[PDB]
Ligand binder design. Structure first.
Ligand code: NGA
Ligand code: CA
Length: 907
């Protein structure tokens, strides 16, 4: 081993620790809350760990140690205090016991010990292991894409390039974890590892990587946003996707296969527009069969089998479509010429057709992106420089066949590809790369998709929700996956539920040609197709809210937010009670349907809807039905048309007109859906949607403020839109403004100031008059947040809103202030009254490996059971089952006038 510390000297640029064994480590102070520790037997102490291949030159760190400056180091002292050596500055006391050589860190502003070694660094069996104290309330996140998982206390996770895309695998590892205690750690290695968060000993956390040295960055911070910002300053801020990357893509090969005319009901038969059924054959599987060769452009008596025909199908079905990959398949290619240049020209023609239709082109790549000889290529080589500058390609997907060796391979490849898009375009195209097999740093270039799974199975949704949440907790906000899987299909219900929740996620890939049916939003019956569209249109309408939380994700909280990120004071937000839900940015709680459980009316039964905060009203997005938080709801009846989504009362949600791609967005309009509740605020981000210029200041922000009464209360409402700050290519200064304000009664008065001058508002007599004029207001009892969903579901889904339209104005030179007297948005709050009812009798009076069921005698319009101090409600009968254990059970009844006293604790 290492032995006692004999000494810690302040050398020129770092602190040099000398151990009894003669082994040395360097501590580098980078800022007042971040330090590198490196124990290097070699004594070389090189800046960068050795990659898997010398040609791998992409670095884990995006900022060199020298770019952090010497100041923190200058303001760090080393003292000998008898039993300890101590390094101290304004941020950190870093304390080493001399004999044991154990390190602990005190965070000075908190005046707490955040990190404590409980056993020394071990180098046994060509592995480098740290051992840390784990506290009873300490929770852990990170590791990258940890398939099926986000919260790691009491578990071990593999920091391994597993190439396992299902539950329990790691699609994209990251040697980065953090503690709720207030520390994050990056291990400065390309080597695989294993982190054990007290799987067996719950007072001990061990972190192991293969190899012979120990190199790590420790950062301390009092907020989850600050931990990620530290990881981001260190390894790279996430890339901001272009607008189009938030829209569903279509991925398939259209250059390779043959379609053969077959009987309806033949296995793999697809109906085409000519009324006939065809089966697809790879050229190797065709044998003696007669079929039609596909092409990208459908120029060879083959149009319905083309890539263009798919773009035409998305248009005909009125489905949003952002981007298209037409070479996604093994040996597919993107042309049928005798040359790379011939092929690039065929791709260019497909790109012009796609762009005419508002769709961008990407390429899949199973290989290196450059010819052997760039000036003299071969047919069937790749040339990303030409694909980009001749053919106009803007996006890339990295197949496992390219990046599958993991670790340094993927980051080098993605760093390379990203640099090519920006240089070849002079920054007119920002990177849009979807990858996997990532590492620390990947997020600065690429988002991830979760790989190959089977859809049309509820497990496809169940495992994916925590997958998304953990990837985002690991400093990768750009996360996505196949729409209903690359394999399987034939389950309408699962197909509908997949589109539903992926509305509130970054990247949606229609990964076509391997499944039990085509992979499109229109693969099922009219009902599925009409719900799919409703939910894709809702995403398109939410694009201003979506883009603003994406900008926030570049240097802050990710877009998919673990409940703990938005409610850090609630135990429930940190555990598996939060594994199947999340906040989509600040304002929406998404609790997807993930199983086939139904009542006798055919609705899905949704158990375990965690609504945080006992003081907070939650509003059903679609219906307006209000719910009180501090509770987990069981038995929430969800029909097929619906996915459980609740607005945080107080929310401001920037919206736009429904659209099928970014060029259909009306840039001379702006719209705000608002749920006034005290004083709330939003920062709307925007830029040119496509270039690197956002990195060089070419963006604008608009700050919106709602200053209204409390949930369900009457008062003055003042909505303010502050002057837009910043500019960018094709910025539109002149815009008309809509406010939709959820309200239960017609208001007393509505006035407006624009840049300090009144604007006379007339009251509309009807919806038609309101939607035709401006400088108007209107109390609308038939306000439909999503008309497509009203019409798909067969419900009106009418809410009451106060809607306010202002004429076009300069958003840069003039603010907006709307004032509403007699503003109220009131409905009955479910679980609104938790006050003891004296007149309600306290409730009177199947075990498996870990599923306890509890029963009692019938008082009460429902009951509530407290399960280890967590309140489960909406229990509509006299039994309830609690599972997912390795516990205590107080119940109470619920009448029309509050609850009963809690029964005594049962075990
Ligand atoms: C993990 C992975 O690479 N999956 C891909 C799948 O997404 C697709 O690109 C397919 C070719 O159509 O090849 C697979 O290798
Ligand atoms: Ca094909």
């Amino acid at each position: 081993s290492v032995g006692a510390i004999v000494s810690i000297e302040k050398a020129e640029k770092n602190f040099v620790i000398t151990y009894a064994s003669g082994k040395k480590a360097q501590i580098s102070i980078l800022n007042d809350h971040l330090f590198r520790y490196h124990l290097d037997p070699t004594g070389k102490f090189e800046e960068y760990p050795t990659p898997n291949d010398p040609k791998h030159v992409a670095k884990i760190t995006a900022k060199t140690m020298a770019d952090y400056g010497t100041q923190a180091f200058e303001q760090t002292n080393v003292t000998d205090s008898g039993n300890q050596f101590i390094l101290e500055n304004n941020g950190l006391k870093i304390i080493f016991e001399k004999e044991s050589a154990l390190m602990k860190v005190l965070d000075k502003k908190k005046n707490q010990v955040i990190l404590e070694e409980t056993a020394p660094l071990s180098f046994k069996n060509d592995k480098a292991t740290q051992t840390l104290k784990q506290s009873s309330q300490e929770n852990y996140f990170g590791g990258g894409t940890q398939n099926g998982r986000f919260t790691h206390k009491g578990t071990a996770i593999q920091i391994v390039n597993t190439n396992n895309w299902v539950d329990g695998g790691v699609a994209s590892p990251n040697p980065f974890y953090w503690s709720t205690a207030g520390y994050g750690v990056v291990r400065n290695t390309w080597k695989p590892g294993n982190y054990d968060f007290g799987s067996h000993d719950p007072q001990t956390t061990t972190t192991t990587h293969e190899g012979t040295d120990f190199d790590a960055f420790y950062f301390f911070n009092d907020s989850s946003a600050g931990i990620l910002k530290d990881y981001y300053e260190l390894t790279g801020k996430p890339a901001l996707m272009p607008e189009y990357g938030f829209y569903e893509a279509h991925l398939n090969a259209y250059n390779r296969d043959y379609w053969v005319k077959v009987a309806e009901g033949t296995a793999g038969a697809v109906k085409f527009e000519d009324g006939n059924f065809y089966k697809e054959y790879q050229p190797g599987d065709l044998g003696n069969l007669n079929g039609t060769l596909e092409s990208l452009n459908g120029e060879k008596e083959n149009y319905q089998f083309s890539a263009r025909a798919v773009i035409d199908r998305y248009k005909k079905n009125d489905m949003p479509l952002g981007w298209f990959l037409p070479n996604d398949g093994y040996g597919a290619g993107y042309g049928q010429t005798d040359s790379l240049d011939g092929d690039v020209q065929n791709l260019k023609e497909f790109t012009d057709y796609a762009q005419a239709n508002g769709v961008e082109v990407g390429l899949w790549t199973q290989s290196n992106l450059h010819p052997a000889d760039p000036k003299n290529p071969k047919k069937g080589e790749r040339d990303i420089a030409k694909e980009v500058s001749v053919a106009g390609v803007k996006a890339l997907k990295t197949d496992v066949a390219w990046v599958g060796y993991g670790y340094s391979f993927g980051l080098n490849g993605v760093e390379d590809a990203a640099n090519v898009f920006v240089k070849e375009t002079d920054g007119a195209v920002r990177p849009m790369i979807v990858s996997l097999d990532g590492w620390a740093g990947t997020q600065r270039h690429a988002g991830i998709w979760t790989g190959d799974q089977t859809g049309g199975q509820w497990e496809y949704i169940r495992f994916h929700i925590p997958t998304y949440i953990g990837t985002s907790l690991s400093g990768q906000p750009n996360v996505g996956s196949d729409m209903d899987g690359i394999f399987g299909g034939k389950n309408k219900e699962v197909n509908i539920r997949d589109f539903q929740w992926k509305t509130f996620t970054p990247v949606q890939l229609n990964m076509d040609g391997w499944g039990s049916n085509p992979k499109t939003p229109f693969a099922f019956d009219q009902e599925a197709t009409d719900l799919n569209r409703a939910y894709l249109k809702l995403k398109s309408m939410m694009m201003p809210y979506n883009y603003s939380i994406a900008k926030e994700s570049v240097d802050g909280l990710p877009m998919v937010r673990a409940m703990a990120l938005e409610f850090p004071n609630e135990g429930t937000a940190y555990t598996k009670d939060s594994q199947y839900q999340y906040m989509w940015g600040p304002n929406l709680l998404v609790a997807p349907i993930y199983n086939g459980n139904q009542d006798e009316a055919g609705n899905s039964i949704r158990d375990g809807i965690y609504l945080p905060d006992e003081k907070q009203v939650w509003v059903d997005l679609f219906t307006g039905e209000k719910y009180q938080g501090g509770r987990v709801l069981n038995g929430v009846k969800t029909p097929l048309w619906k996915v459980p989504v609740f607005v945080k009362d107080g929310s401001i949600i920037p919206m736009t007109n429904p659209n099928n791609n970014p060029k259909e967005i009306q840039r001379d309009q702006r719209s705000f859906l608002i749920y006034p509740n005290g004083a709330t605020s939003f920062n709307m981000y925007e830029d040119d949607g496509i270039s690197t210029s956002y990195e060089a200041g070419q963006s604008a922000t608009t700050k919106i403020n709602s200053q209204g009464p409390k949930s369900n209360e009457k008062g003055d409402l003042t909505v303010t839109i502050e002057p837009t700050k910043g500019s960018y290519k094709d910025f539109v200064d002149e815009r008309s403004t809509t406010l939709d304000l959820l309200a239960s009664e017609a208001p007393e008065s509505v006035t407006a100031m624009v840049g300090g001058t009144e604007v006379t508002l007339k009251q509309a007599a009807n919806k038609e008059e309101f939607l035709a004029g401006t400088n108007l207001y209107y109390f609308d009892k038939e306000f439909q947040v999503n008309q497509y969903l009203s019409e798909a579901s067969g419900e009106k889904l009418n809410q009451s809103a106060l809607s306010v339209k202002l004429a076009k104005q300069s958003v840069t030179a003039k603010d907006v202030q709307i004032t509403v007297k007699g503003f109220i948005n009131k409905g009955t709050v479910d679980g609104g009254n938790t006050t003891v009812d004296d007149q309600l009798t306290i409730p009177a009076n199947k075990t498996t490996p870990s599923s306890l069921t509890l029963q009692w005698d019938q008082v009460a319009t429902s009951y509530e059971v407290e399960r280890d101090g967590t309140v489960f409600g909406n229990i509509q009968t006299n039994t309830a089952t609690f599972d997912g254990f390795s516990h205590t059970f107080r119940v109470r009844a619920v009448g029309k006038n509050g609850v009963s006293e809690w029964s005594e604790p049962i075990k």
